[PDB]
Design a protein around this nucleic acid. Structure first.
Lengths: 812, 43, 59, 132
RNA sequence: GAUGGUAGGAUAGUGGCCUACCAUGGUUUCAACGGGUAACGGGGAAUAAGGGUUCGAUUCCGGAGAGGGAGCCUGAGAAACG
RNA sequence: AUACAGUGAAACUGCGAAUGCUCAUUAAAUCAGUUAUCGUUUAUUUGAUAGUCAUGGUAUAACUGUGGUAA
């Protein structure tokens, strides 16, 4: 029973390990455990130099065995004592377990595998494949490598059988509820279209049903199968020895991208412009931090004195300090000295320290708020480090608009330090994960040239048909996702799985009108809207947070929808296509396959009491919704590190139900904001506060209400609160002889009871004067801070102050 | 034991069978004449 | 967060996985033997009354 | 003594110079700046309680010997249109660099600089109350 | 505490075993004491050598330890050291 | 056998588990002999031996089930 094996299997593994690539296998079957270690031994015997370690990832179970060596040895010893074996017996699988090197890892601990390199990885649980996870492991598998997925489930077995028998039809059972792994179906089909993948069973009877069904063995008997990056490795290299103190470190530098990025930094060292940043946009692990190590090496060998390191968090300063080449002194440690020995990490909020400093490096600029970004782009020298094509941070267009609101040359790192370029798994992964965002740069719509909003149309998407892997639908999907990534600032990879498989989530496209010729060419979106049905119709967010902030069993019984994403482009931000789409969607609510594109008409929505948008608070979008028709509902208090802005939610209702509890909430929330100023957003912009308070004023002075209006205060309660000596000193500073502290003692509650609508109607001072009042009595900041806020270098501040408190005095 | 069986495989010619289941380089830098060798080394 | 909730008259002990931060932070800062409602945690737990009996940490 | 204190690889150290009136405290502080940017790691943060003579405190760069030339408004570094005789480029200029070519200042009321600082040079800290 | 008294604690139990309170003693050229002792030593301890010249065979060595000082725990009996 | 009685795993409980090798040398010490215990202790052995509610409450283990953790 020493059976044969099809040529595809060892042919693929040998060809991969001599092309420095990665292969991927999926095993259906009853065991797969016994068929694994044959592959591992086979891969070493294909090549004796490649890395040994195998990573095993699982959700919470282990297939028929356990890891603790004491447990396995005790069990097997006791099995000898109970007499079920022979003394010197160990099967191939358990041999593999207790002989190789394994890192076991959970799913949730997926972040402890970042910097390592593994020879093989194993994914045990197929029905919980987070995109973020899959990105982790596949990126960290070294070249000449194997990625193997185990597929013990009859459910996926029937799924794949059905898909192979009919690509168009599928198999969906509602025994799960309303959750179906459309992302996993797309995974399986794209894997079918992979150029070096394989689907195989137990006993390795390879299935031709999918994958690279026909690989041929290369003749690897040659030394010239060598990439152009290898071919133009350093050949005019000044590696000579009479003097080469940086030539040593350039020879340490690995790729040609690393080498001429180092050339960029040395040209920058020669360059003596003051306000300057040297920009590296990199793929991940491609020599970014390595270039950081050579940059710090060169800039302490020859640079000013040393550099301040700035990071939003302590990320792998592990490797940033692990770049070495003996403690620092004036001895021949220089080319090893310009490294770990000056351990002084600082916090990136010390931008004035940075302005003083000789040279500053910034790492992963995508997690830095833009005011901090400019405060570090003062008039001095900075090395900017960021990851394009990348999770957890910025995008290409986001970084370009960053440097354009900023400002010099940029450099992008691409060549992977581990595996071979042009990699099939890397390309296929970029395709499936959909991070190839270049659709903005395409020559059809590289410019902003778009029609006018007189005719634009919403389309609801049959997302099942969308995520069904059909190439035109696929094409449409990267187009819209490129829009999505350009629209946001920072993105997570699981979100694609989120809207693909989340039942209550819906997507809409504002599109130009149909081409009247045939409708055969590709539609090209203008805006994309992501919402989710949330409420008693059932999404854990909105009624929960409302119930927490105010006891409202009525709100618990309510049902509506939350807008998660508005999706436009800075090329289209000129006019308000989003406002067009907003009006259209609000009008829709309050007024052999299923088709790829469904018209908005043939799908009745449910009964939506309310619509609420959730977003990180900014001036532009706040102004946008404020010009639009949403009630300011809630603002958080602690701005996170990443966004730098407190979260904030808007609501809007316009139905036959005249709500007015929204108006009650608006009055409460304006009062709450009045409380919360000078507490947590003690220091933020007064005109922003002004915009918020007047938007709240609009919201609680919307239509359909008459008891929500303010009643006039009483002079009885006035004298109840104040003191006649305070009134005397009010008239005294009205005579302008006293001190502004002796008025600021009583300024803030004057602002408080002033900012009620009684005094709002009595005396109208809604200008820069009211801005100054808000700043000095409720933002409670210095007169000097107000002065440089208004950029008025004189006592104009006290001029308007004297005017307005004078107006108060003749009121009194 | 590469040519022999281990695990459960043995590798044939191709068809794997499985079971059932500075002065140093200055001197030796040979495209240099000794004249400029000693000239550089003196400087 | 996994919760083993038992009702001992029926002998019905059932576990639940919760995915949030908020409901578990509601149950935070308690000792064994006390009581916490079901309305602060679950829309399907209104009128439910749950007594702590024990637990296991993450290790 | 202070360069020995600098060569000490500790994080925390206090170097104190209690001088009488009329002994060149500004000369001492500028020498501290030149020393601890020439061999020091990164750069130094300088604090005075007032807009003091920090301009000349940086002007003690290679001059400031027997003839110091402390001048009111005639002095050449005080004059804006100047060549400070010790200009910087891609040159071995370090001790003639750690000075008036990089005039920088910290208000003592913004004490977060000196709460996350690495090396500071302080003119006249006796007037500073103890918690700050 | 060296000798003794008286009293008490302690111990299963006497007794300076231990503490108070005291008395000021005891051993000694009959050599105390001290030193070395190869003290793997000796004991008719041991069956003997049913005739080897003194020799065999057995038994007691004596104590301590169970990583190393320190402390605790049960059981009739342990200062058990698995 | 309609309480069981055969047999019997898990466990309660009773008792035993106080009859192992290595390292250090003392001449009333040890050892041998001989006392005494009207001065003590003793599980076990055997021998005697106590006139001073047609039946009171408990609990567990095991089992069932639900879980945690690399262990």
């Amino acid at each position: 029973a020493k059976k044969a094996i099809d040529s595809r299997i060892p042919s693929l593994i040998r060809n991969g390990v001599q092309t420095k690539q990665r292969s991927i296998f999926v095993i259906v079957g009853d065991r797969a455990r016994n068929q694994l270690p044959n592959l591992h031994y086979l891969m070493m015997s294909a090549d004796l130099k490649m890395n040994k370690s195998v990573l095993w990832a699982y959700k919470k179970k282990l297939l028929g065995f356990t890891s603790h060596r004491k447990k396995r040895e005790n069990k097997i010893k006791k099995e000898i004592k109970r007499g079920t074996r022979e003394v010197n017996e160990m099967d191939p699988f358990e041999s593999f377990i207790s002989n190789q090197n394994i890192r076991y890892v959970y799913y949730k601990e997926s972040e402890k595998i970042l910097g390592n390199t593994y020879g093989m990885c194993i994914l045990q649980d197929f029905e919980a494949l987070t995109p973020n996870l899959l990105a982790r492991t596949i990126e960290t598998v070294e070249g000449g490598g194997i990625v193997v997925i185990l597929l013990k489930s009859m459910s996926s077995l029937k799924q794949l059988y059905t898909m192979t028998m009919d690509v168009h039809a599928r198999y969906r059972t509602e025994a799960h509820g309303d959750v179906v792994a459309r992302f996993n179906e797309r995974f399986i089909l794209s894997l079918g279209s992979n150029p070096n993948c394989l689907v195989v069973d137990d006993e390795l009877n390879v299935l031709p049903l999918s994958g690279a069904k026909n690989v041929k063995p290369l003749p690897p008997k040659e030394d010239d199968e060598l990439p152009p990056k290898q071919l133009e490795l350093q050949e005019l290299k000044e590696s000579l020895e009479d003097v080469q103190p940086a030539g040593s470190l350039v020879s340490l530098s690995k790729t040609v991208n690393q080498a001429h990025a180092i050339l960029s930094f040395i040209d920058a060292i020669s360059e003596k412009t003051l306000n300057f940043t040297v920009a590296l946009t990199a793929g991940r692990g491609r020599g970014k931090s390595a270039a950081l190590g050579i940059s710090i090496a060169a800039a302490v060998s020859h640079g000013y004195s040393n550099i301040f390191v700035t990071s939003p968090s302590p990320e792998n300063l592990k490797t940033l300090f692990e770049f070495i080449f003996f403690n620092k002194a004036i001895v021949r440690v220089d080319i090893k000295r310009d490294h770990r020995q000056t351990i002084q990490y600082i916090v990136p909020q010390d931008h004035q320290v940075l302005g003083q400093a000789e040279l500053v490096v910034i790492d992963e600029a995508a997690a830095i708020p833009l005011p901090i970004v400019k405060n570090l782009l003062g008039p001095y020298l900075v090395f900017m480090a960021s990851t394009i094509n990348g999770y957890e941070g910025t995008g290409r267009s986001l970084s370009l608009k960053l440097i354009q609101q900023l400002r010099l040359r940029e450099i992008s790192l691409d060549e992977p330090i581990r595996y071979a370029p042009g990699d099939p798994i890397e390309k296929w992964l970029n395709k499936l994960l959909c991070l190839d965002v270049t659709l903005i740069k395409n020559p059809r719509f590289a410019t902003r040239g778009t029609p006018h909003p007189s005719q634009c149309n919403l389309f609801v998407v049959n997302r099942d048909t969308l995520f069904s892997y059909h190439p035109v639908s696929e094409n449409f999907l990267e187009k819209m996702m490129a829009l999505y990534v350009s629209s946001h600032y920072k993105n997570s990879p699981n979100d694609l799985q989120l809207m693909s498989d989340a039942p209550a989530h819906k997507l809409f496209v504002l599109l130009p009108p149909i081409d009247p010729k045939d409708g055969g060419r590709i539609p090209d979106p203008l805006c994309v809207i992501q919402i989710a049905l949330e409420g008693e119709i059932s999404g854990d967010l909105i009624p929960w947070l409302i119930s927490q902030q105010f006891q409202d069993e009525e709100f618990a019984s309510l049902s509506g929808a939350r807008i998660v994403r508005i999706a436009t482009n800075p090329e289209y931000a000129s006019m308000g296509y989003g406002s067009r789409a907003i009006e259209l969607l609000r009008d829709y609510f309050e007024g052999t396959l299923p088709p790829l594109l469904l018209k908005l008409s043939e799908q009745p929505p449910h009964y939506l009491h309310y619509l609420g948008v959730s977003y990180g608070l900014t001036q532009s979008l706040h102004k946008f919704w404020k010009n639009n028709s949403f009630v300011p509902v809630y603002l958080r208090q602690t701005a996170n590190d990443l966004t730098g802005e407190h979260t904030c939610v808007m609501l809007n209702v316009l139905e036959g139900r005249e709500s007015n509890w929204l108006v009650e909430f608006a009055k409460d929330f304006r009062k709450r904001f009045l409380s919360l100023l000078s507490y947590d957003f003690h220091k933020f912009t007064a005109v922003q506060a002004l915009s918020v308070i007047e938007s709240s004023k609009k919201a609680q002075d919307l239509s359909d209400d008459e008891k929500h209006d303010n009643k006039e205060l009483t002079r009885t309660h006035l004298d109840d609160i104040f003191s006649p000596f305070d009134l005397k000193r009010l008239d005294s500073y009205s005579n302008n002889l006293l001190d502004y502290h002796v008025i600021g003692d009583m300024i803030p509650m004057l602002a408080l009871l002033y900012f009620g609508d009684k005094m709002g109607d009595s005396v109208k001072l809604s200008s820069v004067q009211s801005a100054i009042l808000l700043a000095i009595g409720l933002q409670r900041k210095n007169i000097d801070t107000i002065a440089k806020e208004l950029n008025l270098p004189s006592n104009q501040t006290i001029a308007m102050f004297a005017k307005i408190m004078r107006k108060m005095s003749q009121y009194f | 034991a590469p040519m022999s069986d281990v695990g459960g495989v043995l590798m044939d010619k191709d068809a794997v069978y499985i079971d059932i289941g500075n002065i140093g380089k200055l001197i030796y830098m040979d495209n240099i004449s000794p004249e400029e060798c000693i000239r550089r080394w003196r400087g | 967060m996994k919760l083993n909730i038992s009702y001992p008259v029926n002998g019905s002990q059932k576990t639940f996985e919760i995915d949030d931060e908020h409901r578990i932070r509601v149950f935070f800062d308690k000792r064994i033997g006390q009581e916490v409602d079901g309305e602060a945690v679950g829309d399907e737990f209104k009128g439910y009354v749950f007594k702590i009996s024990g637990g296991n940490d993450k290790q | 003594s202070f360069i020995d204190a600098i060569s000490e690889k500790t994080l925390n150290f206090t170097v104190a110079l209690t001088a009488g009136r009329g002994r060149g405290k500004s000369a001492a502080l500028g020498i501290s700046i030149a020393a601890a940017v020439s061999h020091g790691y990164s750069n130094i943060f300088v604090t005075s309680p007032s807009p003091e003579n920090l301009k000349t405190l940086f002007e003690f760069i290679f001059k400031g010997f027997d003839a110091l030339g402390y001048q009111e408004h005639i002095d050449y570094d005080i004059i804006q249109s100047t060549n400070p005789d010790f200009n910087k480029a891609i040159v071995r200029v370090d001790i003639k660099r750690d000075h008036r070519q990089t005039i920088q200042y910290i208000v003592p009321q913004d004490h977060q600089v000196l709460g996350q600082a690495e090396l500071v040079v302080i003119d006249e800290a006796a007037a500073i109350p103890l918690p700050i």
